[PDB]
Write a protein that binds this ligand. Sequence first.
Ligand SMILES: Cc1cc2nc3c(=O)[nH]c(=O)nc-3n(C[C@H](O)[C@@H](O)[C@@H](O)COP(=O)(O)OP(=O)(O)OC[C@H]3O[C@@H](n4cnc5c(N)ncnc54)[C@H](O)[C@@H]3O)c2cc1C
Ligand SMILES: Cc1cc2nc3c(=O)[nH]c(=O)nc-3n(C[C@H](O)[C@H](O)[C@H](O)COP(=O)(O)OP(=O)(O)OC[C@@H]3O[C@H](n4cnc5c(N)ncnc54)[C@H](O)[C@@H]3O)c2cc1C
Ligand SMILES: NC(=O)c1ccc[n+]([C@@H]2O[C@H](COP(=O)([O-])OP(=O)(O)OC[C@H]3O[C@@H](n4cnc5c(N)ncnc54)[C@H](O)[C@@H]3O)[C@@H](O)[C@@H]2O)c1
Ligand SMILES: NC(=O)c1ccc[n+]([C@H]2O[C@H](COP(=O)([O-])OP(=O)(O)OC[C@H]3O[C@@H](n4cnc5c(N)ncnc54)[C@H](O)[C@@H]3O)[C@@H](O)C2O)c1
Lengths: 164, 164
Amino acid sequence: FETVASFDFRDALSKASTPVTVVATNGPFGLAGLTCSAVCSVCDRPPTVLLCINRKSYAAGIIKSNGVLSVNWLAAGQAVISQTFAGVGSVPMEERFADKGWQTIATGAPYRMDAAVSFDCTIANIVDVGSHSVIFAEVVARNHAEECTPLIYHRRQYATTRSL
Amino acid sequence: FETVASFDFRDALSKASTPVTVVATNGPFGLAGLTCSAVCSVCDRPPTVLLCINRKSYAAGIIKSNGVLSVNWLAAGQAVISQTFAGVGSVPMEERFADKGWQTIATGAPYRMDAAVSFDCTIANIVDVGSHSVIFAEVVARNHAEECTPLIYHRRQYATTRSL
Ligand SMILES: Cc1cc2nc3c(=O)[nH]c(=O)nc-3n(C[C@H](O)[C@@H](O)[C@@H](O)COP(=O)(O)OP(=O)(O)OC[C@H]3O[C@@H](n4cnc5c(N)ncnc54)[C@H](O)[C@@H]3O)c2cc1C
Ligand SMILES: Cc1cc2nc3c(=O)[nH]c(=O)nc-3n(C[C@H](O)[C@H](O)[C@H](O)COP(=O)(O)OP(=O)(O)OC[C@@H]3O[C@H](n4cnc5c(N)ncnc54)[C@H](O)[C@@H]3O)c2cc1C
Ligand SMILES: NC(=O)c1ccc[n+]([C@@H]2O[C@H](COP(=O)([O-])OP(=O)(O)OC[C@H]3O[C@@H](n4cnc5c(N)ncnc54)[C@H](O)[C@@H]3O)[C@@H](O)[C@@H]2O)c1
Ligand SMILES: NC(=O)c1ccc[n+]([C@H]2O[C@H](COP(=O)([O-])OP(=O)(O)OC[C@H]3O[C@@H](n4cnc5c(N)ncnc54)[C@H](O)[C@@H]3O)[C@@H](O)C2O)c1
């Protein structure tokens, strides 16, 4: 079989819906983070998530060298955080974390305490596939947030959820 | 660092949102499918997605031996399909594909033609983590899909999107 055109793969996926997260890290290689929707739960023992991130991202090599990361699922009111971490405004990495709502829990990675969900993690496995590194991380702590109406991304813009 | 309790991990994840897909297959080993939310896009060259499925399931066994599969991102009106393929109502595996919206495209896997996105795929690699196989699949065809607001899962209920 021949694979579909890269153009067709991306266009088709624009019609899917995803949550929006920020993946962040800190440690001796410095502070970095980026907006990521290619994230999912893998297994619950040991508890493990994965995230796929373009090796061309400035955050990629810093995350992999720090060895720890957080995954922060954003709430519907947090689209400006998603924009910041996607490179809009070109905010310097460190500056992205200036707001007091970013703290640490266990690893030293920045955790967004009012995200719908925030997992603090250590990297367990990295598999490089095409342009991206698929990073498997084990979850060592989490936040305890009240508001969790989701920020969603769909056909190239933000959305949230509705009943039905 | 100690990893969080399994119960605590599933708990937090209920507060995150996901898309809802059906993963299906057919071939020399038979017809099978199940509902899968742990799916994501990996890279666009070669166009590759991944999905995480428990190795204990009837469907996992057949998918892996057929070597081909489709991933079908469901639309907002299709919660009944998601329920069927999660085992709600105990519909026998092979009776699950009655509906005519299921057609063949390239590999012989059944593709849901009215799904928001339907990818027909060949398995490229499998990474085992805990109880799950993370299956990497290369996309060799797609449904050229009519417009569709997607099915989302959040807080143990189905939902769809709206605007901010
Ligand atoms: C909804 C959504 C979902 C997304 N999902 C994903 C995904 O799952 N995976 C993925 O890989 N991408 C994803 N992206 C893309 C991603 O967020 C970013 O890589 C992309 O947005 C590009 O980032 P950037 O413009 O910050 O460029 P980058 O070049 O990666 O980073 C720029 C930043 O690095 C910093 N920096 C760069 N160079 C230097 C230097 N020489 N010295 C000091 N600091 C420097 C700076 O402080 C600057 O602001 C997603 C984007 C959106 C909007
Ligand atoms: C919205 C939604 C999203 C879903 N997403 C996924 C997904 O991304 N991936 C996926 O694999 N399933 C997913 N499921 C589950 C899937 O659809 C089926 O429901 C699967 O065949 C479960 O059927 P069953 O519960 O009757 O298990 P069974 O009929 O009993 O099959 C065997 C059982 O699974 C077992 N088992 C279940 N969970 C674990 C575990 N975490 N570790 C070890 N053993 C386990 C046991 O080993 C036991 O024998 C999802 C379901 C819904 C409703
Ligand atoms: N990615 C998955 O394997 C997944 C996702 C949702 C539900 N299921 C399944 O749920 C069952 C029972 O009900 P429930 O309480 O989990 O619905 P639930 O929505 O209440 O459980 C919460 C969350 O756990 C996450 N997850 C990651 N690995 C998981 C795992 N091994 N088991 C359960 N969740 C996992 C999911 O994203 C899910 O939404 C199953 O027998 C089953 O196979 C599995
Ligand atoms: N997985 C990723 O790397 C990923 C995911 C989303 C967006 N992006 C990127 O998205 C931008 C805008 O995204 P968009 O949805 O608005 O429009 P888009 O038409 O460029 O992409 C549409 C969808 O295709 C998928 N996708 C796009 N590029 C991919 C890649 N290189 N590898 C794997 N999947 C990919 C994603 O699911 C994305 O949402 C960028 O400038 C950018 O680098 C990358």
